[PDB]
Amino acid sequence: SMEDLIPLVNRLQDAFSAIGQNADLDLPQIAVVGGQSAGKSSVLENFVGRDFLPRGSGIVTRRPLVLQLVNATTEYAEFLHCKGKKFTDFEEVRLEIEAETDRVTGTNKGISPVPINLRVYSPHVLNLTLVDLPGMTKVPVGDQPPDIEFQIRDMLMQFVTKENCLILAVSPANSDLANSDALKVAKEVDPQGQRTIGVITKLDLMDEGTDARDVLENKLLPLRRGYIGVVNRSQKDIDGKKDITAALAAERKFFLSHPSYRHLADRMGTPYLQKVLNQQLTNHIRDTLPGLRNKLQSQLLSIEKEVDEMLRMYHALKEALSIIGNINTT
Amino acid sequence: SMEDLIPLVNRLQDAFSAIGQNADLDLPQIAVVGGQSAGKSSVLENFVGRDFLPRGSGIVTRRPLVLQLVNATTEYAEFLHCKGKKFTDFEEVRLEIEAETDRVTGTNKGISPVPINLRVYSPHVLNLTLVDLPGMTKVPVGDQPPDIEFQIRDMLMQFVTKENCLILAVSPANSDLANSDALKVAKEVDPQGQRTIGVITKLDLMDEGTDARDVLENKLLPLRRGYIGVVNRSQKDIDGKKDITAALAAERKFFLSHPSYRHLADRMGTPYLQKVLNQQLTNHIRDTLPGLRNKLQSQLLSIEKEVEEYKNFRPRVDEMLRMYHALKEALSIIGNINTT
Ligand SMILES: Nc1nc2c(ncn2[C@@H]2O[C@H](COP(=O)(O)OP(=O)(O)CP(=O)(O)O)[C@@H](O)[C@H]2O)c(=O)[nH]1
Ligand SMILES: Nc1nc2c(ncn2[C@@H]2O[C@H](COP(=O)(O)OP(=O)(O)CP(=O)(O)O)[C@@H](O)[C@H]2O)c(=O)[nH]1
Ligand SMILES: [Mg+2]
Ligand SMILES: [Mg+2]
């Protein structure tokens, strides 16, 4: 179904452009937040469906990465800071992000508030904006300033305070949920949980004799949108270049076999997280369309009853309305 | 060995009692700080040498436990709130701590700043004050107030602000050290690191492909006194009643077999942390002795001449003799301590 909606939405956005009006679906942006090493970058790139974000132990993401997915015929990527070049090898994209980070922050744990801008072109994506962010901390290391914690907090606040921004509150299972930096920030900016999606990672690392059932069932710390558990690649896995299909296969096996979670399998995992996020995106689209539809109808009526040689407007509006109708039918 | 100093020290504090002076030997108060579930209660009871602190997953320690070790030959324990009762079964002590907590906090995650006073009598301990505290958190659960983080923080602050408080900054290895609540707290109250000891737990739970070598080698986040790693019992271990000896054996085996920690094995483990903590305690005592000795000498010398004439010339004021002997006794004990 998603494969049918995506191409229609791109057509509608183009149609709006032809109309030359300040009207857009205003798709919400996706931001990932949480304590350092919570597993944020893994979560984000999994949603996009490509291995391109630097991941590792310790401090990895040291600058915000503003990613704009752009629907296009060709599949490639390009950074704003690299005018001209078109990356087709995503490993090179990952390497470039790292290199661009080191260039500005150095290699002694430093951080920078300056975003790395990346556009990923593909015909199977929504024109979305996703933001990868540095993890929250408590004490400075290397050459970080004494107030590193607040410099990072400020950094993510500028993204998560944006209206409608979908907040991926990432928390590792091998730590008590009550210590979640992700949830604390989420509750400050979105207290009612209207745009917070709880994500519990590292389920495979829990101490023997423990499990996150109460968390995953949305009972330990209830969230309006609930919680979705995932099991991503470990350091040994990253070191060994384990591929995505294999990681996803291991995650699926994990939920189907674990005695504390198999009854929840159908609501756990990376693929299911993708569906949940895509659903929230679809909900925004369908919720925003009626207002636009009516506006376009009003604009059309004027020219329609009157039917400057600007006859194009009639067809442009007519086109947009035809697309909306198709979307409403899916 | 430490078991040599202990007997001497108690006799010293007793000698001062006979003299009616300030026994002193103001030993530092040891407190465990860290995020919720960092493994504080395990570390604390491991140092005491007995299993009696409630440990488990989720929120366990919901009230401060001010524990006073009291040297005594009978070896037992008594709670201030259990007037007239003395426990001999430390497991019953553990149950009581939990029961007493439930009585005031309920069973729905609630906490209370009202400390639980407990005294453990044993001939293998120094008159110390240990403080078990609730783990720091960020978001409330159950019927905890929305300011749970600060109530817990304030609870700890009442103990760790004291100049004479030895801070055991506990942080689990399977979490990033830079995000440690224990280290944030410790740095705020003791920036120089004069009374902070970094304890790293759960090294056995680290992700495959990672290790805490840089941490344990005092290189990632250097502390004045460094770090000591330990491997305590897991939840499964608690459920299975795994005994202390087995846990200790597994911990030692862990450091000796791990390629990243092998060369550090001799500066790692619970027995080592016990030694290090004991060293700081002993050092405090030794720093205090010169002052006490001098004070005693001055007092002695005064009556010394009076005793001299009493034993040599023709004949109650014999309170002097009692004092003479008590003072002599104390100085001798100090002398014995000085020679270790
Ligand atoms: N076992 C296991 N390891 C995981 C899981 N998710 C992430 N990791 C590991 O945790 C570490 C952090 O991964 P990463 O995706 O970079 O988290 P991040 O929060 O983006 C890191 P930073 O906060 O520095 O940007 C890596 O070593 C990765 O292999 C998981 O579900 N299971
Ligand atoms: N595998 C493993 N588990 C550990 C280790 N230390 C503690 N745990 C586990 O962590 C949990 C918490 O232990 P606890 O000693 O209560 O930590 P605490 O910080 O005192 C808990 P609170 O903050 O509620 O008081 C228990 O399930 C225990 O088995 C360790 O070194 N290894
Ligand atoms: Mg990251
Ligand atoms: Mg405890």
Curated annotation (Swiss-Prot), chain A:
The modification Phosphotyrosine is found at Y76, Y121. It comes from the Eukaryota. Phosphorylated by CDK5 leading to synaptic vesicle endocytosis (SVE) activation. Residues 231-234 are annotated as: G5 motif. One of its GO terms (biological process) is protein homooligomerization. The modification 3'-nitrotyrosine is found at Y121. One of its GO terms (molecular function) is GDP binding. Residues 201-204 are annotated as: G4 motif. Residues 132-135 are annotated as: G3 motif. Residues 24-290 form the Dynamin-type G domain. Changing R286A: Does not significantly affect receptor-mediated endocytosis. Belongs to the TRAFAC class dynamin-like GTPase superfamily. Dynamin/Fzo/YdjA family. This is Dynamin-1. The gene is DNM1.
